[PDB]
From Swiss-Prot, chain A:
Source taxonomy: Eukaryota, Metazoa, Chordata, Craniata, Vertebrata
InterPro entries: Ribosomal_eS27, Ribosomal_eS27_Zn-bd_dom_sf, Ribosomal_zn-bd
The keyword Ribonucleoprotein is annotated on this UniProt entry: yes
Modified residues (Phosphoserine): 10
One Gene Ontology MF term: RNA binding
Function: Component of the small ribosomal subunit. The ribosome is a large ribonucleoprotein complex responsible for the synthesis of proteins in the cell. Required for proper rRNA processing and maturation of 18S rRNAs. Part of the small subunit (SSU) processome, first precursor of the small eukaryotic ribosomal subunit.
Protein known as: Small ribosomal subunit protein eS27
Pfam families reported in the protein's UniProt record: Ribosomal_S27e
Residues bound to Zn(2+): 36, 39, 55, 58
UniProtKB/Swiss-Prot annotation, chain B:
Organism: Homo sapiens (Human)
Free-text function comment from the UniProt entry: Scaffold component of the nucleolar structure. Required for localization of DDX21 and NCL to the granular compartment of the nucleolus. Part of the small subunit (SSU) processome, first precursor of the small eukaryotic ribosomal subunit. During the assembly of the SSU processome in the nucleolus, many ribosome biogenesis factors, an RNA chaperone and ribosomal proteins associate with the nascent pre-rRNA and work in concert to generate RNA folding, modifications, rearrangements and cleavage as well as targeted degradation of pre-ribosomal RNA by the RNA exosome.
Compositional bias segments (type: Basic and acidic residues): 12-22
Whole-protein coverage range: 561 to 609 of 610
Assembly, per entry: Part of the small subunit (SSU) processome, composed of more than 70 proteins and the RNA chaperone small nucleolar RNA (snoRNA) U3. Interacts with DDX21, NCL, NOP2 and EBNA1BP2.
Location in the cell: Nucleus, Nucleolus
Protein name in UniProt: WD repeat-containing protein 46
From Swiss-Prot, chain C:
Domain of life: Eukaryota
The protein, known as: DDB1- and CUL4-associated factor 13
Organism of origin: Homo sapiens
Family: Belongs to the WD repeat DCAF13/WDSOF1 family.
Tissue expression as described in the entry: Expressed in the endometrium during decidualization. Expression is down-regulated in preeclampsia decidual tissues.
Shown stretch of the complete protein: 397 to 445 of 445
Subunit structure: Part of the small subunit (SSU) processome, composed of more than 70 proteins and the RNA chaperone small nucleolar RNA (snoRNA) U3. Component of the DCX(DCAF13) E3 ubiquitin ligase complex, at least composed of CUL4 (CUL4A or CUL4B), DDB1, DCAF13 and RBX1. Interacts (via WD40 domain) with DDB1. Interacts with ESR1 and LATS1.
S-S bridge residues: none
Gene from which the chain derives: DCAF13
Subcellular location: Nucleus, Nucleolus
Swiss-Prot record, chain E:
Highest classification ranks of the organism: Eukaryota, Metazoa, Chordata, Craniata, Vertebrata
Function of the protein: Nucleolar protein that is involved in ribosomal RNA (rRNA) processing. Also plays a role in primary cilia resorption, and cell cycle progression in neurogenesis and neocortex development. Part of the small subunit (SSU) processome, first precursor of the small eukaryotic ribosomal subunit.
Protein name in UniProt: Ribosomal RNA-processing protein 7 homolog A
Subcellular location: Nucleus, Nucleolus; Cell projection, Cilium; Cytoplasm, Cytoskeleton, Microtubule organizing center, Centrosome
Family listed: Belongs to the RRP7 family.
Gene symbol of the encoding locus: RRP7A
Quaternary structure, from the entry: Part of the small subunit (SSU) processome, composed of more than 70 proteins and the RNA chaperone small nucleolar RNA (snoRNA) U3. Interacts with NOL6; required for NOL6 localization to nucleolus.
Tissue expression per record: Expressed in the apical radial glial cells in the developing brain.
Recorded disease: Microcephaly 28, primary, autosomal recessive: A form of microcephaly, a disease defined as a head circumference more than 3 standard deviations below the age, sex and ethnically matched mean. Brain weight is markedly reduced and the cerebral cortex is disproportionately small. MCPH28 is an autosomal recessive form characterized by reduced head size (down to -8 SD) and variably impaired intellectual development apparent from early childhood.
Amino acid sequence: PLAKDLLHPSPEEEKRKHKKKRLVQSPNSYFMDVKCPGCYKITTVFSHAQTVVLCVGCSTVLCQPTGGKARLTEGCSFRRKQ
Amino acid sequence: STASLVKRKRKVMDEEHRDKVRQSLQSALDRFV
Amino acid sequence: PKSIYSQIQEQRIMKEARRRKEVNRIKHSKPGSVPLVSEKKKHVVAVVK
Amino acid sequence: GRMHAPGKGLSQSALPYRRSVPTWLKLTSDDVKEQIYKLAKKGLTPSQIGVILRDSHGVAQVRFVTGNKILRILKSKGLAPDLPEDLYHLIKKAVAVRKHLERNRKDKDAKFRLILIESRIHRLARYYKTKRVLPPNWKYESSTASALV
Amino acid sequence: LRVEVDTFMEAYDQKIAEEEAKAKEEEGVPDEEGWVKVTRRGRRPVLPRTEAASLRVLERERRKRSRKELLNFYAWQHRESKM
RNA sequence: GGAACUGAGGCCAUGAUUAAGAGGGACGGCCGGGGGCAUUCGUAUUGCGCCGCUAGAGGUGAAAUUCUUGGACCGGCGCAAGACGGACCAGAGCGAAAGCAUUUGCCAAGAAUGUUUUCAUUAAUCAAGAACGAAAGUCGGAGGUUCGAAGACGAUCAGAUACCGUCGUAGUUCCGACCAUAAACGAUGCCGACCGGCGAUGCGGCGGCGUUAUUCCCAUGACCCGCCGGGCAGCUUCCG
Ligand SMILES: [Mg+2]
Ligand SMILES: [Mg+2]
Ligand SMILES: [Mg+2]
Ligand SMILES: [Mg+2]
Ligand SMILES: [Mg+2]
Ligand SMILES: [Mg+2]
Ligand SMILES: [Mg+2]
Ligand SMILES: [Mg+2]
Ligand SMILES: [Mg+2]
Ligand SMILES: [Mg+2]
Ligand SMILES: [Mg+2]
Ligand SMILES: [Mg+2]
Ligand SMILES: [Mg+2]
Ligand SMILES: [Mg+2]
Ligand SMILES: [Mg+2]
Ligand SMILES: [Zn+2]
């Protein structure tokens, strides 16, 4: 087999492995800022959302939950946080 | 049991068959037409 | 010896396997999206200087 | 693997190494608590409350923000569940299967599934009695289960 | 009559072609401050911004309210119920 | 109106840390000949009615019992009954096993995947004990097309060449009670850890140069490439 250093994995190796099988566990999910269409209020939405997220200003549907990730509505803009 | 032999032979030949097919591939009304 | 000979055959199989998946990646991607690395300076992580 | 099912899976959550609240979070410890009190009065379980805060309010972990777990926060305020959440849901499932089974005598599979559910109830109840969450006379009965939940 | 139809649709196709080329150029491409717009030209399906789509997703959540909003879970839910 | 001292009450709550590539529960979108109830279609077979035509039809190695001029067999149209679910169907999928295949609706359940949700050791193996358990078979009801142990008839050449034909009892079908056995096989206890490569395959998720359709509702897919999990199976192998 290939020779790997167990103490010093490369960045490409750790991002490919399963999240529980890395040297130190780390999630693949993240939080994002979404900007509503029609009113430009900003809402913080989890990437793998399991509930329908409404804009606080106008109660517009911002996302709909799916199996893996929440699909965003047409016309909104988003940014990753942190 | 020789029933598995024909199955395992067919499974391998199918995989080789995938290889060869991969290699083998390598005026206003005008819009409706 | 058979122990050395077996490892030579196995490591040859793995190396050509990685090459096959690499040419597939560059084919089904943007022409400029794949950096090209020399085999010599591939193994150098960093020079602190 | 699973306690009863043959399959073994690896799907779960992976907590981050860093335990600190991110800077962009503008909610305080007190602000999160009043949100928990509001949703509990609406009739939401502690598992569902944590889901809502994660999806909409950007609270990844209530424990890292306030220093206390959701159930511990509710107990201190006085909004404690009558029955433990995992035990409560198992009893609810057994009632639904038993109601279905009384209209279908020929469903052998449902009869088999009912036995497995009741086994998990007995294991869970035995643990809770040792921890003194339940009185040492609590018993699960099929007729009593409907009134229990 | 035939000339006007041909002239009209020739101009219409040219306008349509320009819009597609501009949309392809803008697809992705975070702007200043780093906002990325969500369109149908990506590989992930997106929720349409139509009245029918919003009513469908909200109705699905409303049918689930019975299961997720409980009436006898908490101790207080029993005591003012007995009143 | 201010301050400083001080005194007893009433409710609720009373806990070592973390969050196991241990386990349970919840949540999300999917997925499957998994199960139960109802509904529905398809030829075929059998029986019956009518029409046309006229000596044979059936069966075998050869025949013979049997049916036929009061019309058999064959051709057409229509009606009824009971079973069955071809081709598509794969070493694919589901279930603890036994097992599971026409459309649509309903009821409850489930694996895997996704999760920065929740509890916090709740776990493993197990005499005793309990649920299920192909086919055949027993008891009581309802039906009976096809097939068919038993039985009665007709024959019984080749031959180490060796078990036919016509009719067809119990059964085969359904609803309840029993019975608890199979080459019920990998002829092969369970849980945990460690220990080589290479591709396909089913499901779920993630990323993607390009093709191909497009969304009132219904729906956001089909193909190609890389990666990650748990499955069904393979090709090759070092040490042991
Ligand atoms: Mg899971
Ligand atoms: Mg994709
Ligand atoms: Mg854990
Ligand atoms: Mg389904
Ligand atoms: Mg199904
Ligand atoms: Mg006649
Ligand atoms: Mg006829
Ligand atoms: Mg069919
Ligand atoms: Mg039987
Ligand atoms: Mg029988
Ligand atoms: Mg009988
Ligand atoms: Mg068998
Ligand atoms: Mg055995
Ligand atoms: Mg599957
Ligand atoms: Mg897939
Ligand atoms: Zn808005």
